[PDB]
Amino acid sequence: SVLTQPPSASEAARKSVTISCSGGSSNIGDDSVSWYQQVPGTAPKLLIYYNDRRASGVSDRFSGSKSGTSASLAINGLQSEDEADYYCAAWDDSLSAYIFGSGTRLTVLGQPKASPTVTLFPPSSEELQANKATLVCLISDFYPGVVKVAWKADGSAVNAGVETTTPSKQSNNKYAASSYLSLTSDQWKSHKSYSCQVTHEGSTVEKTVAP
Amino acid sequence: EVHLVESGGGLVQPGGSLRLSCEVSGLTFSNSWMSWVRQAPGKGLEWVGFIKTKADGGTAAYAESVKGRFTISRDDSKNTVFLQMKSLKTEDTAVYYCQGAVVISHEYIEIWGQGALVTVSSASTKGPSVFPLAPSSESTAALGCLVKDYFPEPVTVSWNSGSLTSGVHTFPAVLQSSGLYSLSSVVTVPSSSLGTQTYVCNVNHKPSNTKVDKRVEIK
Amino acid sequence: KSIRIGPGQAFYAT
Numbered sequence: 551s552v553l554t555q556p557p558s559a560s561e562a563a564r565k566s567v568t569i570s571c572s573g574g575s576s577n578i579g580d581d582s583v584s585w586y587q588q589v590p591g592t593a594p595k596l597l598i599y600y601n602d603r604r605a606s607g608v609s610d611r612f613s614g615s616k617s618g619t620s621a622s623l624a625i626n627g628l629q630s631e632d633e634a635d636y637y638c639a640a641w642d643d644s645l646s647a648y649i650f651g652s653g654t655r656l657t658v659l660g661q662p663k664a665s666p667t668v669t670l671f672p673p674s675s676e677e678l679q680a681n682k683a684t685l686v687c688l689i690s691d692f693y694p695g696v697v698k699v700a701w702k703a704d705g706s707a708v709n710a711g712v713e714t715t716t717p718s719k720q721s722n723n724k725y726a727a728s729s730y731l732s733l734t735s736d737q738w739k740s741h742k743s744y745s746c747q748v749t750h751e752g753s754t755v756e757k758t759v760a761p
Numbered sequence: 762e763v764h765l766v767e768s769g770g771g772l773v774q775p776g777g778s779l780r781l782s783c784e785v786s787g788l789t790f791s792n793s794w795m796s797w798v799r800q801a802p803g804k805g806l807e808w809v810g811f812i813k814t815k816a817d818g819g820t821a822a823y824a825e826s827v828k829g830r831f832t833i834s835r836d837d838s839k840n841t842v843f844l845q846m847k848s849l850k851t852e853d854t855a856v857y858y859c860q861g862a863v864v865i866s867h868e869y870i871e872i873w874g875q876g877a878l879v880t881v882s883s884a885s886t887k888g889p890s891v892f893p894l895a896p897s898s899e900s901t902a903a904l905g906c907l908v909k910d911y912f913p914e915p916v917t918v919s920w921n922s923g924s925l926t927s928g929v930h931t932f933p934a935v936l937q938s939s940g941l942y943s944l945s946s947v948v949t950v951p952s953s954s955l956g957t958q959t960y961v962c963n964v965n966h967k968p969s970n971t972k973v974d975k976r977v978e979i980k
Numbered sequence: 981k982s983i984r985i986g987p988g989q990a991f992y993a994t
Contacts, residue, residue, distance in 0.1 A: 593873040641989065864991065
């Protein structure tokens with residue numbers, strides 16, 4: 551008794567998609583289906599309940615149907631703000647639990663290329679004296695979500711002390727990541743400069759700071 | 762209009778206990794069917810249980826994996842439903858969401874809280890050190906706060922006690938080689954504002970009862 | 981048998 555959904559779905563803007571949801575006689579076959587929307591790092595939100603009823607405030611572009619042991623969610627006039635995980639759900643009588651489907655991630659095709667913006671902060675006097683010297687490289691507004699981060703000291707590459715996040719989707723559906731280089735206070739003064747370089751397909755953006 | 766505000770999140774050692782609260786405003790709590798749903802980092806939604814209105818059973822129901830360990834209860838006079846968790850396993854690590862549902866004029870309403878992260882780990886709670894990041898001639902300037910070496914997640918960052926919101930970007934945490942988290946928050950402000958305007962980042966790490974405000978001044 | 985809805989199984993109708 552597991553509601554299965556395709557992992558992914560991807561359709562162009564202004565267009566429409568159907569997210570499928572298939573269960574069994576013990577859940578969708580006895581009970582109604584609900585549909586939820588979850589935008590990255592936000593609470594899930596009810597879209598549809600009782601198979602085909604829209605929650606208050608929810609756009610008429612959404613509609614749900616139930617058919618036997620299957621359920622469907624239609625999204626018409628696709629907007630970029632619809633990029634999220636969609637989850638069906640239904641009560642299962644045999645195991646007496648509310649089951650959430652595995653969920654479909656929705657991608658609205660057409661988002662433009664975007665080169666990253668890069669902001670680089672040097673260690674502060676406070677950090678240096680607490681021996682927590684950290685170079686902070688903040689990277690945002692890029693699409694698609696893949697970057698390579700490289701640090702340099704005096705033109706020479708550095709790999710020790712480097713930690714870099716995986717990119718994550720921003721509210722505006724562009725991406726952000728950050729990279730930190732940890733130094734001893736002494737290392738910070740031992741060099742004329744450090745630089746953070748970010749590569750994003752055909753474009754490279756580099757920033758440099760100094761003592 | 763409706764808010765479900767959860768609290769009690771944080772770090773607990775395996776086998777330990779932790780109580781989450783969910784307090785409802787804007788709905789008549791006494792008429793709301795209350796429930797809990799959890800989500801492990803990077804995974805799907807998994808039902809935890811519910812508790813009926815008094816007029817209905819007043820009784821609770823539980824997922825098989827939490828039965829006997831977790832207890833859901835309600836205090837109608839204080840508009841709060843609780844999830845009491847005992848004998849916690851590392852597997853229970855998840856953001857826990859509460860729901861309130863009411864039926865009115867043939868309208869079904871179901872509202873979700875913001876979630877509380879429960880971290881079941883043998884690790885220690887550690888408050889972060891906060892470091893203002895000051896700017897360097899341009900029309901706008903980026904300034905920040907580094908929130909370094911904390912456990913567990915989350916921290917929230919605001920600026921000027923939440924009255925500065927535009928141009929604020931708080932970045933996801935990195936996991937350090939020590940197992941501690943660091944993050945940064947930046948706000949980009951007009952450069953002409955500097956020096957007639959003071960900027961302060963407000964950093965809250967509720968699992969270590971740490972709140973820290975740091976003025977970010979032009980060094 | 982009663983029609984209920986959601987993670988709280990709210991009573992909806994019969």
